Symmetry: C3
Subunit: 605 residues, 3 copies
């Protein structure tokens, strides 16, 4: 007769549970603990890197442009038969007694060349001292001077050749590279001797490819400016090497101080040293890097030419404290040195707040414990350290915040059990069915709960009695409707009344005193049945009623994917191209010349 309007649901008959099946709620579980926070040491650090810069210094070249042209005289013209150009090494004595001394040069070259002592007279006249004037102007140039301007050629009248001599002096830039046993000039000439060669200290062990009299060292030299004529106010030690083609002078200075194989790279006001995994971590918050190192300091003794390290190390460390923690913190021992992957040498100065000044004694002892010739190689890319630093910092948070939640969760559950405990006491069925993940019947046998599964009844095989007032015992009116049903389609018809959430209770025992304005709704099928004044009215669907929710919401979204495409500022080729001249490309073209423009096989007779 009155069948379910909404069929998108199920019905259940839950017969009383015997001691057949009984379960117990799990007890509160043990909660995880926030990890003991990492301990960080404050400290200052300076980071050094393989020094790739060459040694630089000033030098002065003295030499002579010795030219000899030969000329054939045509009836109405002239033709060079030859033009011989050479370089004469102005000698020690002329550089001291003539040039430096008075600012003049002789007009004559006299040197060895191919094992013979040749000699050139300017214009082939008697020797004549000539004042040196600055070279002509030119953008981007060291200083320079010369005596002669033009070239002297023989007249038709006449020594069938013409000789020219131009005394030249330049303040070239010198550059040398490790091992620094030879150096180079601005002109492109090598000089096969150490820039630190000399007679003072152990400097005489330095390298040299030349005989002893080539080299000479004036001890107490006041050079005078060739433009201002001024005299040096302080003396130096002037070195003078005389090669076959020139005499080169610079100021000798002690080696060790002058150079270094590592380069101070960065200053980190707040470098943090963490201890983990049998290694150290040096996170520079500002620089966004984290260096990894053994727990053993590095022997600066093992370093080849590293005087500058501790020099700068202290300077920066002394200078930094004086500004940042001049009175904020206190040093904990002496600077220390560690070598990180990437070949970065970290000098570290462990700090300590005035707050925990009590801990000084202990700390100190654990720092001095770390205290125990070759070159260090440095990678070009610091990327891995910034990755490390980055990844670590994020991982840290993620884990931290997440951990905290895992706990907040656990605890929450433990407590909520105090709520399910009493709740099952109320509707053992509701609670039970929501614990076994299925519809069951259950009752309380003391402190445990007995259960028994329910049987699904067809949605078609359920019918609602039309009234709710008992004819037999008037003055009484049930509170829950009555129904009929069959577990099978062709099956018999069973009596019983309705219960919460489509439970077809067999025994019709629920009744209340009859009343007026007694209208109710009942969970019937996929919707509700509407009874008014203890008598049926009509059916509905859940859609007809305004919903409210018991769930706090949460809109979690995924961090979506992202592709990192190859991206580069300057490609390799751009860089190569960034050089105005290319030796290789040119050489290749230069040496092709006679192949493209001549004939290198034919033999004439």
């Amino acid at each position: 007769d009155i069948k379910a309007e909404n069929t998108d649901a199920n019905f259940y008959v839950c017969p009383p549970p015997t001691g057949a099946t009984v379960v117990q709620f799990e007890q509160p579980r043990r909660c995880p603990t926030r990890p003991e926070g990492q301990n960080y040491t404050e400290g200052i650090a300076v980071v050094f890197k393989e020094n790739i810069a060459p040694y630089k210094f000033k030098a002065t070249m003295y030499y002579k442009d010795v030219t000899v042209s030969q000329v054939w005289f045509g009836h109405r013209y002239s033709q060079f038969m030859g033009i011989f150009e050479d370089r004469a090494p102005v000698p020690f004595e002329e550089v001291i007694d003539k040039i430096n001394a008075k600012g003049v040069c002789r007009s004559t070259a006299k040197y060895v060349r191919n094992n013979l002592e040749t000699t050139a007279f300017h214009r082939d006249d008697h020797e004549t001292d000539m004042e040196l004037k600055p070279a002509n102007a030119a953008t981007r140039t060291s200083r320079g001077w010369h005596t002669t301007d033009l070239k002297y050629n023989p007249s038709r009248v006449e020594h069938r050749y013409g000789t020219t001599v131009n005394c030249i002096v330049e303040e070239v830039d010198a550059r040398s590279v490790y091992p620094y046993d030879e150096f180079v000039l601005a002109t492109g000439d090598f000089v096969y001797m150490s820039p630190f060669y000399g007679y003072r200290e152990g400097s005489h062990t330095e390298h040299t490819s030349y005989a002893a009299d080539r080299f000479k060292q004036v001890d107490g030299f006041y050079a005078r400016d060739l433009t201002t004529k001024a005299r040096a106010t302080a003396p130096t030690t002037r070195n003078l090497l005389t090669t076959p083609k020139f005499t080169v002078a610079w100021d000798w200075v002690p080696k060790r101080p002058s150079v270094c194989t590592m380069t101070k790279w960065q200053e980190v006001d707040e470098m943090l040293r963490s201890e983990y995994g049998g290694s150290f971590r040096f996170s520079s918050d500002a620089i966004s890097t984290t260096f990894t190192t053994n727990l053993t300091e590095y022997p600066l003794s093992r370093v080849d030419l590293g005087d500058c390290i501790g020099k700068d190390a202290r300077d920066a460390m002394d200078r930094i404290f004086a500004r940042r923690y001049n009175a904020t913190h206190i040093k904990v021992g002496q600077p220390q040195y560690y070598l990180a992957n990437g070949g970065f040498l970290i000098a570290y100065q462990p700090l300590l707040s005035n707050t925990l000044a009590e801990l000084y004694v202990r700390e100190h002892l654990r720092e001095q414990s770390r205290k125990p010739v070759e070159r260090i190689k440095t990678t070009s890319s610091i990327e891995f350290a910034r990755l490390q630093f980055t990844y670590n910092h994020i991982q840290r948070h993620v884990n931290d915040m997440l951990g905290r939640v895992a706990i907040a969760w656990c605890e929450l559950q433990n407590h909520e059990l105090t709520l399910w405990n009493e709740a099952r006491k109320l509707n053992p069925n509701a609670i039970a069915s929501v614990t076994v993940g299925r519809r069951v019947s259950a009752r309380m046998l003391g402190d445990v709960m007995a259960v028994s599964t329910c049987v699904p009844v067809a949605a078609d095989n359920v019918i609602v009695q039309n009234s709710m007032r008992i004819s037999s015992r008037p003055g009484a009116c049930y509170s829950r409707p009555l129904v009929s049903f069959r577990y099978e389609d062709q099956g018999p018809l069973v009596e019983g009344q309705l219960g919460e959430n489509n439970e077809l209770r067999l025994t019709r025992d629920a009744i209340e005193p009859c009343t007026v304005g007694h209208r109710r709704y009942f969970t019937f099928g996929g919707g509700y049945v509407y009874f008014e004044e203890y008598a049926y009215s009509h059916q509905l669907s859940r859609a007809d009623i305004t919903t409210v929710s018991t769930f706090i919401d949460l809109n979690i979204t995924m961090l979506e994917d992202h592709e990192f495409v190859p991206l580069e500022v300057y490609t390799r080729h751009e860089i190569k191209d960034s050089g105005l001249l290319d030796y290789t490309e040119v050489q290749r073209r230069n040496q092709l010349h006679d192949l493209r423009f001549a004939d290198i096989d034919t033999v004439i007779h």
Copy 2:
């Protein structure tokens, strides 16, 4: 007699609480609010970088190979006494009237060299014009031409010398670098003048190291191809510089347009400008970068030679809109220019959706507000920007999703209080003990709760009466068992009955009407006691019963650690090595020659 089988637990006696101790549940707390979302401006952007590429252009060299050999004649052989090679600067007039004009050269050189006007006749014959033929073949070469192939040497019959002259013309590649006041050829020769030198416009202020008649500028030049003989269809302005060793010609073109000190680097269809921390952010989603900048635009006026910037800037910006937002969006003003860390110049075109077209007026005003000679230096690494971009994007999510949860949590708690409120009303003890984190006794004094701590009773000092049926008042049967106990080992024996979770209630007041099939379980010690038909049966352990849980699970795992090792494609050395010839290495070896193979000290007599 009947003692606890499972001893891994505790018992408690909770005596009624007086007004001595009373507490109140905390009220719902104030929840945090989702931060006002960041506002992003849509826009197009082009990124420029310090231009490191040299200026390139085509040039043509004209010069002459002037050779003079001298030969001694042996009885049965011949030996060169000398071989003098030089370069003659074909002069302006010959390049215009002979070469370019007819495709021929003279067989004679006539130039200044060492302040004398020498002259060479090919084979020392009368002057003779000679057609230029292409140079021989060679892989990877500019074009070239010449008149002569072989070298003329004197016979034993005879001017005791032989003269050769080969007119050479090459279409070399020229390259110049900022400040562009001088340039270089493909052969390796410098030319100390600006490629933009000339007589037109302000070009005459350009640089030059040569006298005025060296340089000449034909205004209206139709060059003819030396291979195809074709004549140029359009005239140019042919420059011609005549150096001591050659005459070099190229086409003068105005400077400013021709060059630039910044290089268009990338085009970003969707560049996003965010405003934060007194700076801007330019995230290129595609390129995975984020640039940081002041909120003030950059003066392109301040830029040295940046004509190309706005040139390309517009081009790309006009071209991009036309494709992407041709009708999707609308421009919001004129392109703007900002300078980011790393020295990347960002030209930006703020966009706007047709949707919010109403906001045009306001936006425009806030963009025009930003509108207000030196070179910009660019880092080689864009890594920090990709790190920035990366880190920012992840941080964003993390914070966002996490924030949302913190709230969902708060709210959840607030509501659940409506559940604890009523629950304590049920089992004030259970709820109380789970709020003070310890076992206590409590009752409800109106709206507050009175409490009093419980006393722990030894697990050994507890005993269960064997029956549950009162002899005095048969027909009645308690619902909770009875027990005995002592707070001390040597202590007296106290009477009382059992309660939920090992509570030893002193007063034995819980009783129910006697029934059949009345079996129950009771929380006794580390397990349960089993009573059947109001009479003891046996004890158990919680292990014997199937557990169900009231906790929703969560399997949170840590993001584990990871080490980023130094990783590099090409090391520094590999790069250096990538050059076929090494000037330094060679020079070093070349200049050693006379040290290894001769004797540079001995003087013969």
Copy 3:
């Protein structure tokens, strides 16, 4: 009379709800599902990169220093008129019959130069064979030998010139670059022929710029050491190219094996191949990189000179398995080759655990499915791959852990509904007011809930009756206080008693049997009212009572912002500077010489 002491709150009158308004709790929602985990293939991989290294090999130069000086004799001095230096190509026959054969050279040069067969006699004496002695010492040098030490100059007695001849032999280093059709020496001389030129195999198709008799190839050559005199134990194929200035010999070896255009870069013991988005992913956990590729293998056939690839590919792959999975896993087919963005060629060997050995047949078929002249260009930066790898790994976790929580949340809610269901049954008002987010009145009409909003009553317009014992029916004593009030300020005074949380119930129906020690607290205003023995005592504030909480706590903090500043080890300039000599800088200075020190315009007569 007795008004609220604490006014920081509100009062409400909740009149019974009719069927006017009725709502329903939302049903449990459908929960999201953990995504099907990504399937990863185990495998070994080797990564190759554009080979930028030049080809290297050893070579030997044989040539002669032919010098001719001319000397004028002064009365008391001597002057070089000229010094002509040249290089003579020791010929094939002399290198085989004299030098290599006996370790001696002739004292005479005889070669073509400028199309004439000149000849030099050492000191102009009869020919004389001379043993070659090692060159002098010099740090960092290939081997070398020579016959002569000094230079022979003419005496005043006399052929008015002096001739010198020094036979030179050096074991130079050779270098060639793709296309490898020409190579270079350590001295700086080009040799325009392929290092792989010869007569064997197809080698004769190799390049050459020289006539056929220049080149000669001895098939079966036992070179003898010029220092140890030892003879080679095994013969080679000695090549000998005779250029105009020297004869250069090396050992011919087949091309293809000798070179390669890609360079084995890294070995990845555990490379993981993921399949996604129509592409592959190759995450190297160790190297912290992830490569992206099409799902189609790459044709090694398409590779120009890649013999070495598969050579090394197998070697590493065979060598690795043998160590790691020698018996742990099993190979799944033949090595495969893919090309990733960045131009990295990935050779991959899919693996498989002995565990799932059953799946072999299927897998194999899906791998062989992927199996199907130009050079590959490689970026210099691997950063994007490490970013990819990094970002992906973090994203993975975040999403994963978060997803899990979203679920744990959903479920939690669904269940808790079983708790709100029964709770509303208890205090329909409390529960209702905490579901509509506002204070309302509600009752249960069967399975739905009827509601009706409450009316706010002024905090000023509320008053508490002083007693709680009814005079009319003594022996009885209400459980809840009584009050008076007005909805308006000037309004009438309404009777009614107090309820939970400031609800002003109109009907005074709550009463209990009178008792002693009957003290209670009541939620009155911003605090409590204290009644003792059914008679008023005093008021309080919530501050006076010790609070306990029903909320599990959670301290979520934000991951804070961080700025990644431009950071670089060596700048671009530092790198450029890292070269001891700079061809460009020098050339620029060299070619300026005659501008600064002479006069290149004046013509003398």
